[PDB]
């Protein structure tokens, strides 16, 4: 039997099949492994943040404003926590030498990753927990 007997059969039998819906993997955030986490990792003058989820915006924002105060009142620079509003939640400030993030009185609590910090050196790459919501501060353009 020259025919049919020489048919390759697929090994590794799979009867535990599922529907191939076709999940398409991709990336959108800049996540190339930082060569030297220092001055060349960090941005120059301006920096950026992405909102990982929150009523504050839920988008990505550029900070080139010397002092950006997070509140929720018409006179506040940016709107932060809407559902659980502290009059003065947090304040993101960019300084000619360094980046600094200060809690100005968030009742929900401002935590860096999982660390309670009322003042923190603003780090690019880590996520700032604003109450329950999630904001990530990243290194903006060094260009």
PDB file of C-alpha atoms in Angstrom:
ATOM      1  CA  UNK A   1       0.000   0.000   0.000  1.00  0.00           C
ATOM      2  CA  UNK A   2       2.018   2.852  -1.335  1.00  0.00           C
ATOM      3  CA  UNK A   3      -0.822   5.332  -0.919  1.00  0.00           C
ATOM      4  CA  UNK A   4      -2.457   6.246   2.414  1.00  0.00           C
ATOM      5  CA  UNK A   5       0.173   4.305   4.366  1.00  0.00           C
ATOM      6  CA  UNK A   6       2.682   7.054   3.755  1.00  0.00           C
ATOM      7  CA  UNK A   7       0.482   9.705   5.246  1.00  0.00           C
ATOM      8  CA  UNK A   8       2.154  11.624   8.101  1.00  0.00           C
ATOM      9  CA  UNK A   9      -0.086  11.616  11.111  1.00  0.00           C
ATOM     10  CA  UNK A  10       0.056  14.583  13.494  1.00  0.00           C
ATOM     11  CA  UNK A  11       1.439  13.559  16.839  1.00  0.00           C
ATOM     12  CA  UNK A  12       0.379  15.182  20.081  1.00  0.00           C
ATOM     13  CA  UNK A  13      -3.304  14.480  19.851  1.00  0.00           C
ATOM     14  CA  UNK A  14      -5.460  17.305  20.868  1.00  0.00           C
ATOM     15  CA  UNK A  15      -9.088  16.676  21.590  1.00  0.00           C
ATOM     16  CA  UNK A  16      -9.088  19.375  24.209  1.00  0.00           C
ATOM     17  CA  UNK A  17      -9.497  21.874  21.425  1.00  0.00           C
ATOM     18  CA  UNK A  18     -11.143  25.197  21.745  1.00  0.00           C
ATOM     19  CA  UNK A  19     -12.388  27.703  19.249  1.00  0.00           C
ATOM     20  CA  UNK A  20      -9.689  29.748  17.729  1.00  0.00           C
ATOM     21  CA  UNK A  21     -11.158  33.183  18.245  1.00  0.00           C
ATOM     22  CA  UNK A  22      -7.783  34.605  17.367  1.00  0.00           C
ATOM     23  CA  UNK A  23      -6.516  36.804  20.117  1.00  0.00           C
ATOM     24  CA  UNK A  24      -4.192  39.365  18.667  1.00  0.00           C
ATOM     25  CA  UNK A  25      -1.310  40.276  20.918  1.00  0.00           C
ATOM     26  CA  UNK A  26       0.293  43.704  20.561  1.00  0.00           C
ATOM     27  CA  UNK A  27       1.838  46.568  22.491  1.00  0.00           C
ATOM     28  CA  UNK A  28       1.143  50.276  22.670  1.00  0.00           C
ATOM     29  CA  UNK A  29       3.237  51.524  25.580  1.00  0.00           C
ATOM     30  CA  UNK A  30       6.923  52.199  25.113  1.00  0.00           C
ATOM     31  CA  UNK A  31       8.602  49.410  27.016  1.00  0.00           C
ATOM     32  CA  UNK A  32      12.000  48.819  25.638  1.00  0.00           C
ATOM     33  CA  UNK A  33      14.482  47.752  28.320  1.00  0.00           C
ATOM     34  CA  UNK A  34      16.132  50.994  29.506  1.00  0.00           C
ATOM     35  CA  UNK A  35      19.786  51.075  28.728  1.00  0.00           C
ATOM     36  CA  UNK A  36      21.276  52.677  31.826  1.00  0.00           C
ATOM     37  CA  UNK A  37      18.603  53.779  34.257  1.00  0.00           C
ATOM     38  CA  UNK A  38      19.918  57.260  34.791  1.00  0.00           C
ATOM     39  CA  UNK A  39      19.953  60.651  33.132  1.00  0.00           C
ATOM     40  CA  UNK A  40      19.425  59.129  29.704  1.00  0.00           C
ATOM     41  CA  UNK A  41      16.461  57.137  30.946  1.00  0.00           C
ATOM     42  CA  UNK A  42      14.750  60.150  32.429  1.00  0.00           C
ATOM     43  CA  UNK A  43      13.361  63.003  30.247  1.00  0.00           C
ATOM     44  CA  UNK A  44      14.555  66.573  29.907  1.00  0.00           C
ATOM     45  CA  UNK A  45      12.366  69.328  31.312  1.00  0.00           C
ATOM     46  CA  UNK A  46       9.044  67.718  30.551  1.00  0.00           C
ATOM     47  CA  UNK A  47       7.717  64.308  31.575  1.00  0.00           C
ATOM     48  CA  UNK A  48       4.576  62.265  30.997  1.00  0.00           C
ATOM     49  CA  UNK A  49       2.022  60.237  32.843  1.00  0.00           C
ATOM     50  CA  UNK A  50      -0.495  57.742  31.748  1.00  0.00           C
ATOM     51  CA  UNK A  51      -3.590  56.972  33.612  1.00  0.00           C
ATOM     52  CA  UNK A  52      -3.750  53.261  34.065  1.00  0.00           C
ATOM     53  CA  UNK A  53      -7.380  53.880  35.140  1.00  0.00           C
ATOM     54  CA  UNK A  54      -9.127  56.670  36.986  1.00  0.00           C
ATOM     55  CA  UNK A  55     -11.975  59.307  36.811  1.00  0.00           C
ATOM     56  CA  UNK A  56      -9.224  61.946  36.744  1.00  0.00           C
ATOM     57  CA  UNK A  57      -8.800  61.543  33.013  1.00  0.00           C
ATOM     58  CA  UNK A  58      -8.083  57.997  32.010  1.00  0.00           C
ATOM     59  CA  UNK A  59      -5.739  59.085  29.265  1.00  0.00           C
ATOM     60  CA  UNK A  60      -2.144  60.131  28.866  1.00  0.00           C
ATOM     61  CA  UNK A  61      -0.924  63.573  29.824  1.00  0.00           C
ATOM     62  CA  UNK A  62       2.260  65.596  29.368  1.00  0.00           C
ATOM     63  CA  UNK A  63       3.646  67.589  32.222  1.00  0.00           C
ATOM     64  CA  UNK A  64       5.672  70.612  31.359  1.00  0.00           C
ATOM     65  CA  UNK A  65       3.879  72.754  33.893  1.00  0.00           C
ATOM     66  CA  UNK A  66       6.229  73.649  36.819  1.00  0.00           C
ATOM     67  CA  UNK A  67       3.537  72.764  39.315  1.00  0.00           C
ATOM     68  CA  UNK A  68       0.452  70.743  38.482  1.00  0.00           C
ATOM     69  CA  UNK A  69      -1.947  70.483  41.401  1.00  0.00           C
ATOM     70  CA  UNK A  70      -4.426  67.647  41.538  1.00  0.00           C
ATOM     71  CA  UNK A  71      -7.755  68.657  42.956  1.00  0.00           C
ATOM     72  CA  UNK A  72     -11.301  68.617  41.627  1.00  0.00           C
ATOM     73  CA  UNK A  73     -12.496  72.168  42.058  1.00  0.00           C
ATOM     74  CA  UNK A  74     -12.912  74.703  39.182  1.00  0.00           C
ATOM     75  CA  UNK A  75      -9.826  76.522  40.455  1.00  0.00           C
ATOM     76  CA  UNK A  76      -7.747  73.364  40.716  1.00  0.00           C
ATOM     77  CA  UNK A  77      -5.194  72.723  37.955  1.00  0.00           C
ATOM     78  CA  UNK A  78      -6.247  69.179  37.147  1.00  0.00           C
ATOM     79  CA  UNK A  79      -9.155  67.058  38.275  1.00  0.00           C
ATOM     80  CA  UNK A  80      -8.154  63.956  40.124  1.00  0.00           C
ATOM     81  CA  UNK A  81     -10.575  62.062  42.230  1.00  0.00           C
ATOM     82  CA  UNK A  82     -14.134  62.794  41.363  1.00  0.00           C
ATOM     83  CA  UNK A  83     -15.996  60.131  43.246  1.00  0.00           C
ATOM     84  CA  UNK A  84     -13.992  60.539  46.403  1.00  0.00           C
ATOM     85  CA  UNK A  85     -12.697  64.032  46.226  1.00  0.00           C
ATOM     86  CA  UNK A  86     -10.114  65.473  48.526  1.00  0.00           C
ATOM     87  CA  UNK A  87      -9.976  69.315  48.221  1.00  0.00           C
ATOM     88  CA  UNK A  88      -6.275  69.072  47.626  1.00  0.00           C
ATOM     89  CA  UNK A  89      -5.367  65.563  46.686  1.00  0.00           C
ATOM     90  CA  UNK A  90      -1.853  65.529  45.318  1.00  0.00           C
ATOM     91  CA  UNK A  91       0.525  67.742  43.512  1.00  0.00           C
ATOM     92  CA  UNK A  92       2.895  66.863  40.731  1.00  0.00           C
ATOM     93  CA  UNK A  93       5.757  69.203  40.365  1.00  0.00           C
ATOM     94  CA  UNK A  94       8.630  69.210  38.002  1.00  0.00           C
ATOM     95  CA  UNK A  95      11.734  70.939  39.109  1.00  0.00           C
ATOM     96  CA  UNK A  96      14.723  72.028  37.080  1.00  0.00           C
ATOM     97  CA  UNK A  97      16.878  69.550  38.938  1.00  0.00           C
ATOM     98  CA  UNK A  98      14.546  66.696  39.785  1.00  0.00           C
ATOM     99  CA  UNK A  99      10.996  65.441  39.680  1.00  0.00           C
ATOM    100  CA  UNK A 100       9.042  65.540  42.945  1.00  0.00           C
ATOM    101  CA  UNK A 101       5.564  64.340  43.826  1.00  0.00           C
ATOM    102  CA  UNK A 102       3.932  65.624  46.966  1.00  0.00           C
ATOM    103  CA  UNK A 103       0.748  64.694  48.731  1.00  0.00           C
ATOM    104  CA  UNK A 104      -1.016  67.834  49.686  1.00  0.00           C
ATOM    105  CA  UNK A 105      -3.741  66.119  51.685  1.00  0.00           C
ATOM    106  CA  UNK A 106      -5.344  63.237  49.906  1.00  0.00           C
ATOM    107  CA  UNK A 107      -7.813  61.542  52.205  1.00  0.00           C
ATOM    108  CA  UNK A 108      -7.817  58.514  49.919  1.00  0.00           C
ATOM    109  CA  UNK A 109      -4.088  58.318  50.249  1.00  0.00           C
ATOM    110  CA  UNK A 110      -1.352  58.699  47.717  1.00  0.00           C
ATOM    111  CA  UNK A 111       0.923  55.678  47.515  1.00  0.00           C
ATOM    112  CA  UNK A 112       3.834  54.953  45.237  1.00  0.00           C
ATOM    113  CA  UNK A 113       3.356  51.409  43.995  1.00  0.00           C
ATOM    114  CA  UNK A 114       2.479  50.180  47.515  1.00  0.00           C
ATOM    115  CA  UNK A 115       4.555  52.610  49.609  1.00  0.00           C
ATOM    116  CA  UNK A 116       2.763  55.318  51.697  1.00  0.00           C
ATOM    117  CA  UNK A 117       4.612  58.497  50.845  1.00  0.00           C
ATOM    118  CA  UNK A 118       3.444  61.999  51.486  1.00  0.00           C
ATOM    119  CA  UNK A 119       6.497  63.183  49.679  1.00  0.00           C
ATOM    120  CA  UNK A 120       8.308  61.141  47.129  1.00  0.00           C
ATOM    121  CA  UNK A 121      10.948  61.677  44.542  1.00  0.00           C
ATOM    122  CA  UNK A 122       8.939  61.308  41.390  1.00  0.00           C
ATOM    123  CA  UNK A 123      10.122  58.221  39.630  1.00  0.00           C
ATOM    124  CA  UNK A 124       9.580  57.412  36.055  1.00  0.00           C
ATOM    125  CA  UNK A 125       8.296  53.911  35.453  1.00  0.00           C
ATOM    126  CA  UNK A 126       6.516  53.226  38.706  1.00  0.00           C
ATOM    127  CA  UNK A 127       2.821  53.606  39.332  1.00  0.00           C
ATOM    128  CA  UNK A 128       1.256  56.065  41.669  1.00  0.00           C
ATOM    129  CA  UNK A 129      -1.810  54.834  43.410  1.00  0.00           C
ATOM    130  CA  UNK A 130      -4.191  57.627  43.812  1.00  0.00           C
ATOM    131  CA  UNK A 131      -6.637  56.307  46.298  1.00  0.00           C
ATOM    132  CA  UNK A 132      -7.845  53.183  44.593  1.00  0.00           C
ATOM    133  CA  UNK A 133      -7.123  54.439  41.108  1.00  0.00           C
ATOM    134  CA  UNK A 134      -3.989  53.884  39.171  1.00  0.00           C
ATOM    135  CA  UNK A 135      -1.753  56.410  37.472  1.00  0.00           C
ATOM    136  CA  UNK A 136       1.679  55.650  36.067  1.00  0.00           C
ATOM    137  CA  UNK A 137       4.337  58.255  35.679  1.00  0.00           C
ATOM    138  CA  UNK A 138       6.786  57.663  32.868  1.00  0.00           C
ATOM    139  CA  UNK A 139       9.864  59.158  31.434  1.00  0.00           C
ATOM    140  CA  UNK A 140       8.842  61.614  28.848  1.00  0.00           C
ATOM    141  CA  UNK A 141      10.798  62.578  25.788  1.00  0.00           C
ATOM    142  CA  UNK A 142      14.457  63.054  25.965  1.00  0.00           C
ATOM    143  CA  UNK A 143      14.934  64.245  22.479  1.00  0.00           C
TER     144      UNK A 143
END
